[PDB]
Symmetry: C3
Subunit: 170 residues, 3 copies
Amino acid sequence: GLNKFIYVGLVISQLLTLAAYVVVTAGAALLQKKANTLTLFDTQEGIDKYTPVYKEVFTATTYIIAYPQQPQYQFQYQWWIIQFELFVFLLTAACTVFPSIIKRMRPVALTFIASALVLVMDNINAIFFLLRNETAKAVFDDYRIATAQAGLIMVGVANGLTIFFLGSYD
Amino acid sequence: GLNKFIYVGLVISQLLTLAAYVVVTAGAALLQKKANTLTLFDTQEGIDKYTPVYKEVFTATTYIIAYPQQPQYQFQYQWWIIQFELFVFLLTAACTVFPSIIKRMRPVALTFIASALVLVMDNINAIFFLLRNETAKAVFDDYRIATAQAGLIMVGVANGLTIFFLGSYD
Amino acid sequence: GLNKFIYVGLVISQLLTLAAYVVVTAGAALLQKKANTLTLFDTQEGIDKYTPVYKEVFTATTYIIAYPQQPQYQFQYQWWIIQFELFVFLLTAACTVFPSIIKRMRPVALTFIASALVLVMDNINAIFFLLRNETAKAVFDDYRIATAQAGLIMVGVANGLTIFFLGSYD
Ligand SMILES: [Hg+2]
Ligand SMILES: [Hg+2]
Ligand SMILES: [Hg+2]
């Protein structure tokens, strides 16, 4: 009846997820590259000058930790929620392709996607501050900050639909 | 036998969730009314002296991001869980009003309420420091902070009960 | 069939959860020992001097709030996730020792362990900065922080294994 209507919505949200996943990978790789190449800390004048300013803008956002001379560590926690969200998608998508296993494995996937949703919400609230900060948009390109943003907003929304449809099936 | 007990514990927990929404929104609006009236940044004089404390006080908590001259974004993440709790309350309540759909719908609510709960727990640790910080209590008065805090404690336990009752049911 | 394999994974994960629980509490007791006794603030020289950088290092992490002169509250949010992990242990061990109670009580334990898993993650990404930050390792010795970070990894994994087997059981 509508249980056939539901499997469709679950099929959509997995495309929505996988679509979202690529957009976050885009924005994250953009910022990581931009962080990997930074003119600021090269000369020691721009170290004593820009190390406090770098630390205080990334700390001001209360999620991302500041790693001024460690660009690989800067986004380490943002790279994590992407890895985690893919691990969930590996499950939630395999729930869709072989729906027979939803009986057994659905409580597992929800327990993980419940946790994943919190890290995205924490990120969005934190990265929204990055877009409202001019110095942030200056050093890290404002479109790279925005690409990662909408990527996560898609993830959270795709998780919401993944929660509804996979939550109620059969 | 055990079920009619759990349904009452579920209906009771659903009502205590409702009373928790008031006290939260009360102190949340009380703090917001305080954030909109701040005369610190009225005088350009006070703009320079009070801003370093205003940022430090809020950023000393690892949750609430400091928006000194943007009072609308100050509590933005507090209002989020309020709306998110409201959305999750819509899910959990319709479960208890039409218990037949607890079968199909239940894991949707448990997934969100999980994500919703940690957002509640992360908030209380923050507000606690604000209750333990004198500068914050002078600007935003204590009863406003404590009211928002008292409410946050109430939706926390109410969500905890809903997980125990709605969680284990027929 | 494969069901008894899942149960073997559950028993080992439940014992890995208990085994992990000790290592974190040790690393937490080490830090609280070092926090409850430190002479930085013994004299008014160290109070005015080291308090700004004390509040700088903890707030440099995006998680742990800085309480320089009140060591009782210093690690407060870290002791919290330790009790929440134990409360879930009562739930998931009751499920694992008495599998009868699983069907009704598993969503209760799953919803709670879903929220517990994100607090362990948020802690890890934070205390990692402590390990990567030189000034923080001189006050609280590096072995104490690693002892704490050890148990936090072991706790998060055993939660992931528990969620897998306890979620997929029967
Ligand atoms: Hg699955
Ligand atoms: Hg519902
Ligand atoms: Hg249980």
